[PDB]
Design a protein around this ligand. Structure first.
Ligand SMILES: Cc1ncc(COP(=O)(O)O)c(CN[C@@H]2C[C@H](N)[C@@H](O)[C@H](O)[C@H]2O)c1O
Ligand SMILES: Cc1ncc(COP(=O)(O)O)c(CN[C@@H]2C[C@H](N)[C@@H](O)[C@H](O)[C@H]2O)c1O
Lengths: 414, 414
């Protein structure tokens, strides 16, 4: 009966393509091609760079005054980290359940990630877990709005404010979502974004840092352009717009003109796309609830959700002896679309191997601190055993598609 | 009479635009747009990624079996360093005279850069300096083919081999140059490239690592894709092509498909554009020689030069107490094209401030070793005080263009 064991698939036809190119992209790219400036680090040519146009637009969209575009969400994390003053030996609190980059970025600026457990329904950083993990070395909190949920920002902001800690929102999986009507990434110290391929807003690769703090964005600017930042006023044509101010050392984490032009165009269809997903997901939550599955929920205070990924936990007492990879494999086969397990908890992820990397060999104390064996994360581990996920391309079709998703799940439950 | 001092400029006509888009780009990009895969970290869709196409193109272009593309010349360096096993506290020998990233990339893997003086005429890393600077802590040598010159690679390889030290060629400023017939970056352990805007091969932002060691490439691969590597053979369509091997922890420094596609197109005309620059530079060498200027020279054995930038030392006993910035500012106003001082030596570069980044505060002994105040680089200092430069866009025009350059020099020199 099951396709994985040679049965008939329920469905094999294609799902929606991703990404969906916005209509203005080829013109915007053509204009870049002819501009005589393909990165911000090239000389001023008399008009505004697409790096700036995008920054302006993305800032406006998130309802903040500052944005610094960047090469990747990995870069965005690291820039935001270092702009908070985070450095060698500082503890950064992070959720245990996220893509591996959530741990490796902290490592990459020589800080010590302090993996904290997550809420069992939303899978976002547990505030109770955060308070318990604060030490005298703690210097930042990173919160991920994971898959389709927002974290409990009222509680987290409360803990950050009390302790005098910056709170960074990693919105790689949440673009355009809103908590109490404020766009996610505009609620705390700084917001951080991926525009990698799979993300709801994408240029194949990219990122951004957003903030309400001018000095913060200025530090970020230095950190992404080798200690340079854009002049207040444009210079004459042929002169560098990035000035060697040298307030703070940096590296190059710049976003190309091509990618900036692409994101500006993709941004104009973002909300429409998120509406399509949102509606389909509302439909699915119902169908899957009827089967005893528990979809991921969102924190109280959330006013709109962005579905980067649909995550749903299997019903208690069903397939409890079958490894999730098998379950997810059988679903994949019925559906014609990947259905994958939840991320492993980071300290148990085979991709997280800091002792293999000589960059991090900083002597015994630091090696003890960053040893991932120190972290047990009951909720993350359970979620990893029990929760499967679908990428959001699956939410971009018809209401009928949701029926297929439910049919596959029902089939596999027997 | 000087334009800068109120007078009439010599030239106001515009100079060649840069970058020059290759004719296949729009179609290439449109192909990306509709492909359903905008990065390598997106699932496989039944055809080769542009990342693979460019990679294979650039490997073959350089005479070597392996190429791993990357997000920038900065990433490329850091990838190469970690793939040599460089980590915390290791010393890496580097030239004193180069863009600041040559220093900060080393710092970023927690290593201790050891700036060494250069050859007074080629401005490239001096063999004697390198030999003098070796210690039991040295774990690599990085050499830069600076501006338009190639280093003495036979001399450098010989020192590398004697000491059992890997030798990385930073070829950011030398795409397609050849030493004794062999493509630059194919001469030692690994070659790193920047495709930033201003470089001769560009996608606004981009880079590559090339090597003939398959294991080394595999390590680079892991290091750029968060501990993942492309499968030996493609998976089924819809499956991830990057596989979580667990062999080696990494970070995201992937290059987007859009950039990959652009670089594959721009590769097809690189040789022709290099020929143009070459002929203009030859002719300009003579003209500037007749004024007592000394053009940058290249190492014996160079079989062809890539001009990323035309560098030239001012004549001895002439303007010999006017700041270089002042001379370079005067030439610019005469030429309607930017002419700039050489790089400062990195330890004296205001962009180079380790003390400003708490990331590096690893302890007293480390902090002292990475203090740039420890260094003395007399040749770098002298060249920086007397050398001015023109980006290679100047070299893309006529012989009349070369005469304008000479005629600006002539005029400034009184
Ligand atoms: C919460 C969060 N924080 C930072 C990042 C890092 O963003 P990037 O450097 O753009 O990859 C991501 C990206 N995460 C994705 C996750 C995906 N499973 C993987 O295949 C992909 O390469 C990566 O872009 C994330 O989800
Ligand atoms: C020898 C060498 N090694 C590594 C790099 C680093 O490459 P990227 O990360 O691509 O900038 C460069 C680039 N250097 C350039 C130099 C230029 N003056 C500056 O305005 C520009 O932003 C930068 O890309 C280099 O020349």
């Amino acid at each position: 009966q099951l396709a994985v064991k040679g049965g008939e698939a329920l469905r094999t036809r294609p799902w929606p393509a991703w990404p969906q190119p916005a209509p203005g992209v080829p013109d915007a790219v053509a204009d870049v091609l002819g501009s005589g400036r393909w990165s911000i680090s090239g000389p001023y040519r008399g008009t505004e760079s697409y790096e700036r146009r995008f920054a302006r637009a993305f800032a406006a969209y998130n309802g903040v005054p500052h944005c610094v575009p960047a090469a990747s969400g990995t870069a965005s994390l690291m820039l935001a980290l270092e702009a908070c003053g985070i450095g060698a030996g500082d503890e950064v609190i992070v959720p245990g359940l996220s893509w591996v980059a959530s741990g490796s970025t902290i490592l990459g600026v020589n800080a010590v990630p302090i993996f904290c457990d997550v809420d069992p329904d939303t899978l976002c950083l547990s505030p109770e877990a955060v308070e318990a993990a604060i030490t005298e070395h703690t210097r930042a909190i990173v919160v991920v709005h994971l898959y389709s949920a927002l974290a409990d920002m009222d509680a987290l902001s409360a803990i950050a404010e009390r302790h005098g800690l910056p709170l960074i929102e990693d919105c790689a999986q949440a673009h355009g979502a809103t908590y109490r009507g404020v766009k996610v990434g505009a609620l705390a110290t700084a917001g951080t974004f991926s525009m990698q391929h799979s993300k709801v807003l994408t240029s194949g690769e990219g990122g951004a840092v957003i903030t309400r703090d001018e000095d913060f964005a200025r530090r970020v600017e230095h950190l992404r352009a080798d200690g340079r930042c854009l002049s207040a006023v444009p210079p004459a044509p042929g002169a560098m717009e990035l000035v060697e101010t040298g307030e703070l050392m940096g590296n190059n984490r710049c976003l190309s003109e091509f990618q900036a032009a692409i994101l500006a165009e993709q941004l104009t269809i973002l909300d429409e796309q998120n509406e399509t997903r949102r509606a389909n997901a509302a439909h699915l939550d119902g169908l899957l609830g009827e089967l005893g599955l528990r979809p991921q929920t969102t924190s109280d205070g959330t006013t709109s959700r962005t579905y980067y990924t649909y995550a749903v936990r299997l019903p208690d007492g069903v397939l409890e002896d079958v490894p999730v990879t098998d379950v997810s494999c059988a679903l994949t086969a019925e559906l014609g679309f990947p259905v994958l397990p939840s991320y492993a908890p980071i300290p148990a992820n085979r991709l997280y191997t800091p002792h293999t990397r000589r960059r991090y060999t900083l002597g015994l104390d630091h090696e003890r601190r960053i040893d991932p064996k120190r972290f047990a994360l009951p909720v993350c581990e359970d979620a990893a055993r029990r929760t499967v996920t679908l990428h959001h391309a699956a939410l971009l079709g018809d209401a009928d598609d949701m029926g297929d998703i439910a049919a596959a799940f029902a089939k596999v439950l027997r």
